[PDB]
Chains A and B, each alone.
Chain A
Amino acid sequence: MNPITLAIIYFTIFLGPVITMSSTNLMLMWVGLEFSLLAIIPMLINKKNPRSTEAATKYFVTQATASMIILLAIVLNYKQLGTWMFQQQTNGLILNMTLMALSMKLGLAPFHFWLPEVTQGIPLHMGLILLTWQKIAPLSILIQIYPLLNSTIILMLAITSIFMGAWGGLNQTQMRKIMAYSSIAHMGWMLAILPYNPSLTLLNLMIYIILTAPMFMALMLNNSMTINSISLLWNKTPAMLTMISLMLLSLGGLPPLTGFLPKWIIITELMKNNCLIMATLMAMMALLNLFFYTRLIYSTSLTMFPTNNNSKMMTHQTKTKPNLMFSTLAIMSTMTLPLAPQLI
């Protein structure tokens, strides 16, 4: 990429979420969403492999129709209130549209089909951006409008996502898609507490970002899109085997690690609000997510899969190092739990 183009695109992919967050005029929030859609598509097809064009063409159509639905909600509001922004008075259907639409861009629940497929055809790098710096934008729009959205729908999309994410993940063996599925799940918890305590959504996101960003830079350190590929981690780079183990169990909710806090406080907030029906079912299938996380643990760490002689060759050569971010985001993530009170 002519480095100039790289700058323009990257600026847009970054001006995209930032305009959304900063503005209050919904319109300006919509174009922030629009710029993110335009900026991400070029990077998605960088290899320009036949799989890639498929990825972008799906991502784009799914993103575009949702963008149009979000605009329709703003256009309708404009006629039910002269304001260009959702208010207490807003017709309920107007808000529900925004939930569905925004739940498509974020890819939650019954609209979770595009994400796993686009996460499969894009590079590991652009995978991260597509999973974590593109969720900030839509979520911002929701978090702003939380007082007004429906508790019922969110919960249904929340629970569905948790289930779909978990069930989908169990079968998958491609890593990119295992992560895509996890993101659907975590995204679910996040949207469950939005109606009740938005501030916790912003924790269940950061922690997801501080967990997923190290996890993916791990997958690419050896650029392994297969579990079999990550399983030979012990030969290619032995040290990351320890933290890859804890980060994945952290992604699932197991108690000593940082990953428990988001689930724990979301459950505490939902029980405070009396959803002890919903919270219970979510926590239970949340346990299904750890099963596929630990199955990967087995292959990568607890058991040593057989490797190839040609690997001895890759050991010889100095391994290009993992950026510092890996460490700082691996530790702050695997073990901050002793510092939970200040996080929330």
Chain B
Amino acid sequence: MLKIILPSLMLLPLTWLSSPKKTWTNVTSYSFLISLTSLTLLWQTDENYKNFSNMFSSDPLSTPLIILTAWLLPLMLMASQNHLKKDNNVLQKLYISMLISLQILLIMTFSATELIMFYILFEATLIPTLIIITRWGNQTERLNAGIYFLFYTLIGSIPLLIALILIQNHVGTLNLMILSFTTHTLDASWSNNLLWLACMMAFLIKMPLYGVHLWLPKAHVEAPIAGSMILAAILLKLGSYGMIRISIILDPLTKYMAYPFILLSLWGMIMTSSICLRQTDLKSLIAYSSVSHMALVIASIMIQTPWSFMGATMLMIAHGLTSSLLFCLANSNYERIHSRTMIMARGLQMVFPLMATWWLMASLANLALPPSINLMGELFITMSLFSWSNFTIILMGINIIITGMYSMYMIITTQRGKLTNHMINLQPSHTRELTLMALHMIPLILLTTSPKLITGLTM
């Protein structure tokens, strides 16, 4: 997998060497094709994993993501052509390159055989992200948000560093292939009960768990649209990908060491879903929607039943695409409105007829409408959770009712009701804004036709 990567690196030379006026089209047009080369990995004609080479591999779980990581770079660069079009021609070429490095790094992290290669690349992605959030962040508080995003991930990260070096000494190689075909069975000691927490905690932090998710609402609030898309679509899912590949070892402990997180997540799912119900900042509501719909995932990567896992793989890819779509349209309202407040800007369909159709489809993806991969995902996690304990439906049942309420409230108070009297007149929709959306949903429609590709390792 060096075509999904080397051609990517070369994007950096192109963003720099290219003309200031033509820099945007060379980069966006080329990475669209970079995504097309990424699609070749999907050609798996047998169940064996495609080990491209010693360090680089792609199995069913990584492949559905590498393609998404390559896909969003085009979109990210199309959603940030407006803001970042007021810059000095060298601030742009920095932002474009920053976005380019994220998927170079993220493509490799999702396509990495050695778990510590994951760690080095895993924690590197913070550098590009923190720059995108802090350097271009509009609000006074991004310095703070950046600190929260760096420390919560970093304090979790050093325990994983110690744990992975620890298993290398215990087993003798951090190669995901071998670690899988070798006998690593923890022994339920008090210490192992700590190892397990060391490995999972760093992944559980960037996958916002109810206890440590305050970093994500603060980060996406002041982050520029491209950073918020990256955090929701690819960055948070880095934590999920890690939990799937790391729990191959630590096989016995999670049977009983998971209860704490599972309950934290399911109760967390309800409270995070509910506070979405009365949050005035739209970007705030989407972020907590992201916490709740990701709290379902940590509760399926821990129950560990075949269906959970691919419920997880289905939902992660699906929610990634949906969340960005929501964060992308939130930005289009923010740029014309100039405020994140949900109460202002009422009645837009009256003035932006189509964006409202995109808003409606994004919300229906947000809630579980049935001919969507989003629902298949939740339906499956719901099933397994029920298997874990029939009572789980109650808590995963209060979340579904709340999820319907906030998803439609975003449509009802932003895209319906009487028009706002006279905010700065709202200029019509650009074709870029609409495509950036179409590019998010057309793939959501196509993937829903053949869900098999994003089903995970389990199935």
Residues of A within 8 A of B244 (CB): none
| Docked pose: A100 CA to B135 CA in angstroms | 45
**B124 close to A256 (CB less than 8 A):** yes
**B120 close to A267 (CB less than 8 A):** no
Given A254-B126, A256-B120, A302-B134, also A280-B151 (CB < 8 A): no
| Docked pose: A43 CA to B146 CA in angstroms | 42
Residues of B within 8 A of A254 (CB): 123-124, 126-127
Residues of A within 8 A of B151 (CB): 287, 291
| Docked pose: A292 CA to B198 CA in angstroms | 25
Q: How far is the CB of B391 from chain A (nearest CB, A)?
A: 38
> Contacting chain B: which of A152-160, A167-175, A268-276?
A268-276
**B162 close to A302 (CB less than 8 A):** no
Is A307 positioned at the interface, with any CB of B under 8 Å from its CB? Answer: no
| Docked pose: A249 CA to B150 CA in angstroms | 12
**A260 close to B120 (CB less than 8 A):** yes
Is A141 positioned at the interface, with any CB of B under 8 Å from its CB? Answer: no
Residues of B within 8 A of A255 (CB): 119-124
Question: Chain B at the A interface: mostly helix, strand, loop or mixed?
Answer: helix
**B165 close to A271 (CB less than 8 A):** yes
Residues of B within 8 A of A283 (CB): 158, 161-162
| Docked pose: A301 CA to B134 CA in angstroms | 10
Is B445 positioned at the interface, with any CB of A under 8 Å from its CB? Answer: no
Residues of B within 8 A of A124 (CB): none
Interface string of A315-344 (1 = CB under 8 A from B): 000000000000000000000010000000
**A294 close to B150 (CB less than 8 A):** yes
| Residue of A255, A268, A287 contacting most chain B CB atoms (<10 Å) | A255
| Docked pose: A268 CA to B126 CA in angstroms | 23
Residues of A within 8 A of B6 (CB): none
Residues of A within 8 A of B169 (CB): 271-272
Is B147 positioned at the interface, with any CB of A under 8 Å from its CB? Answer: yes
Is A279 positioned at the interface, with any CB of B under 8 Å from its CB? Answer: yes
Partner of B143 from A284, A291, A303 at Cβ < 8 Å:
A303
Give the interface size bracket for B toward A: 20 to 34
**B127 close to A256 (CB less than 8 A):** yes
Residue of B nearest to A301 (CB): B135
Q: How far is the CB of B169 from chain A (nearest CB, A)?
A: 6
Residues of A within 8 A of B127 (CB): 249, 254, 256
Partner of B155 from A279, A284, A298, A302 at Cβ < 8 Å:
A284
**A279 close to B162 (CB less than 8 A):** yes
Question: Chain A at the B interface: mostly helix, strand, loop or mixed?
Answer: helix
Residues of A within 8 A of B271 (CB): none
Q: How far is the CB of B459 from chain A (nearest CB, A)?
A: 34
**A302 close to B147 (CB less than 8 A):** no
Is A290 positioned at the interface, with any CB of B under 8 Å from its CB? Answer: yes
**B158 close to A284 (CB less than 8 A):** yes
Chain A, range 253-309, C-beta contacts under 8 Å to B: 254-256, 260, 264, 267-268, 271-272, 276, 279-280, 283-284, 286-287, 290-291, 294, 298, 301-303
Residues of B within 8 A of A264 (CB): 161, 165
Is B154 positioned at the interface, with any CB of A under 8 Å from its CB? Answer: yes
Partner of B134 from A286, A287, A298 at Cβ < 8 Å:
A298
Chain B, range 118-171, C-beta contacts under 8 Å to A: 119-124, 126-127, 130-131, 134-135, 143, 146-147, 150-151, 154-155, 158-159, 161-162, 165-166, 168-169
Q: How far is the CB of A303 from chain B (nearest CB, A)?
A: 6
**B162 close to A271 (CB less than 8 A):** yes
Given A267-B165, A268-B165, A294-B150, also A280-B131 (CB < 8 A): no
Chain A, range 7-58, C-beta contacts under 8 Å to B: none
Residue of A nearest to B124 (CB): A256
Residues of A within 8 A of B120 (CB): 255-256, 260, 337
Partner of B158 from A249, A271, A272, A287 at Cβ < 8 Å:
A287
Residues of B within 8 A of A271 (CB): 162, 165-166, 169
Partner of A280 from B119, B122, B146, B159 at Cβ < 8 Å:
B159
| Docked pose: A287 CA to B158 CA in angstroms | 8
Closest 8 pairs (CB-CB, A-B): A256-B124, A302-B134, A283-B158, A255-B120, A255-B123, A271-B165, A302-B135, A268-B165
Interface residues, chain A, with chain B CB atoms under 8 Å away: 249, 254-256, 260, 264, 267-268, 271-272, 276, 279-280, 283-284, 286-287, 290-291, 294, 298, 301-303, 337
Interface residues, chain B, with chain A CB atoms under 8 Å away: 105, 119-124, 126-127, 130-131, 134-135, 143, 146-147, 150-151, 154-155, 158-159, 161-162, 165-166, 168-169
- If A256-B105, A298-B134, A302-B130 are given as contacts, then 6 extra A-B residue pairs at C-beta distance below 8 Å, sorted by A number, are A255-B123, A256-B124, A276-B166, A283-B161, A294-B147, A303-B134
